[PDB]
């Protein structure tokens, strides 16, 4: 039977980038042709593989990561990028093999009063490893004196709210992102095009 890409793309609610979702897709036949011609996408960039070649390729597992970021931050979802999102939230490897698909979701994820449910990680001591997820909410220590779990001076809550509003500029508007990762191990492949 077909692979459930619709459950990821057509999902009624998306995850925050710091707690990005990942769907492991296995043991199915993937119909990439109908998937890529469904909705209209503002960003469609693939690395290490072509979108038309996926129908002829088989993989052991296929991963579909999904989250929400700002408009001006979609450029950080790519191999060899840096920034608050790529360093502290969602990081792609330098030899990433897959596709990044994003579309404007101002009509879904922005409220007139401001949608403060989508957060990103602002503070972190070090960068993330590729495909590393950090859902910690421990008070960040920016000074010598420890914080002991209470936010104060040099003691910051690590997560920051987006607050989307429908009339913002497109750089500040919410975008839903789907990243397709194609794992190729020395194991029998279960997902074919």
């Amino acid at each position, epitope marked *: 039977n077909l692979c459930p890409f619709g459950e990821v793309f057509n999902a009624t609610r998306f995850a925050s980038v710091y707690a990005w979702n990942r769907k492991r897709i296995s043991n199915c036949v993937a119909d990439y042709s109908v998937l890529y011609n469904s909705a209209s996408f503002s960003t469609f960039k*693939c*690395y*290490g593989v*072509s*979108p*038309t*070649k996926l129908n002829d390729l088989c993989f052991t597992n296929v991963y579909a990561d999904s989250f929400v970021i700002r408009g001006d931050e979609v450029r950080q979802i790519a191999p060899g990028q840096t920034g608050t999102i790529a360093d502290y939230n969602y990081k792609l490897p*330098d*030899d990433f093999t897959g596709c990044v698909i994003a579309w404007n979701s101002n009509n879904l994820d922005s409220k007139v009063g401001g949608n403060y449910n989508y957060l990103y990680r602002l503070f972190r001591k070090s960068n993330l490893k590729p495909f590393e997820r950090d859902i910690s909410t421990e008070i960040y220590q920016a000074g010598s004196t420890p914080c002991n779990g209470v936010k104060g001076f040099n003691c910051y809550f690590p997560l920051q709210s987006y607050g989307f509003q429908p009339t913002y500029g497109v750089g500040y508007q919410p975008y839903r992102v789907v990243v397709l990762s194609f794992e190729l191990l020395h194991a029998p492949a279960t997902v074919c095009g």
Partner: antibody, heavy 120, light 109 residues
Framework: VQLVESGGGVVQPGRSLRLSCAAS????????MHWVRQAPGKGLEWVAV????????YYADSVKGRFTISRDNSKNTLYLQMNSLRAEDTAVYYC??????????????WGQGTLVTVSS | DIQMTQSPSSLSASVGDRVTITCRAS??????LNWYQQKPGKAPKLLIY???SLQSGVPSRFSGSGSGTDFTLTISSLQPEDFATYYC??????????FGGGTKVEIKR
């Protein structure tokens, strides 16, 4: 394996122009097709691409929402619709067969190209 | 966007000499680096695909190498018909295919 283009010419700014490119001597209905231009005295620039069945179309950011690529597998031909043409589009447009020996795109066979000059 | 830098922009070599063109990438493009040859007034032709694989019909004197960010095209013995412009084109970003600046091989006198 040969590719023959046509349709190039002179077009005023904002008007439209349609280019064609006919293939031969290979399974055209299973290979992806590209369009690549080159301004006079400049380098090459990848423009667009279409799938083997014609369902998927991907364009460069410089011609997105402005050019359109299409094909007809029963006739083994390829097209490129160029609407709202600007002076920067003035270039020699080539069609390129996609080599299928890699997971990525690469142009293993080109066409002789046709010149498109845009100005009033 | 991935920028491809070629060096030099032009060179002068005679028949039989060994020519090596360099093509650097602003980021790691793995091994997806293609080389093309364009005669003045003619269409480009594929020479090397995937950094080092030789396209069918291309003479044996052409050879490619390199990985990551540094790539090299080598003509073991230059011939009078091999004087043209040589572009390198990365294919790692398949939906943002970028070319190099080009390297024109010219006759020395």
């Amino acid at each position: 394996v040969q590719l023959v283009e046509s349709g190039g010419g002179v077009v005023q700014p904002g008007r439209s122009l349609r280019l064609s490119c006919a293939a031969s001597a290979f399974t055209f209905s299973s290979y992806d097709m590209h369009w690549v231009r080159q301004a006079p005295g400049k380098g090459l620039e990848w423009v667009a691409v279409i799938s083997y069945d014609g369902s998927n179309k991907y364009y460069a950011d410089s011609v997105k929402g402005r050019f359109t690529i299409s094909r007809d597998n029963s006739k083994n031909t390829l097209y490129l619709q160029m609407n709202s043409l600007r002076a920067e589009d003035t270039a020699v447009y080539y069609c390129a067969k996609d080599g299928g020996k890699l997971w990525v795109y690469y142009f293993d066979y080109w066409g002789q190209g046709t010149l498109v000059t845009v100005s009033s | 966007d991935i920028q491809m830098t070629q060096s030099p922009s032009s060179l002068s070599a005679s028949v039989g000499d060994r020519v090596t063109i360099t093509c650097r990438a602003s980021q790691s493009i793995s091994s997806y680096l293609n080389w093309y040859q364009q005669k003045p007034g003619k269409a480009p032709k594929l020479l090397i695909y995937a950094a080092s694989s030789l396209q069918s019909g291309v003479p044996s004197r052409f050879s490619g190498s390199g990985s990551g960010t540094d790539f090299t095209l080598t003509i073991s013995s230059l011939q009078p018909e091999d004087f043209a412009t040589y572009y390198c084109q990365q294919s790692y970003s398949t939906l943002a295919l970028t070319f190099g600046g080009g390297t024109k091989v010219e006759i020395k006198r």
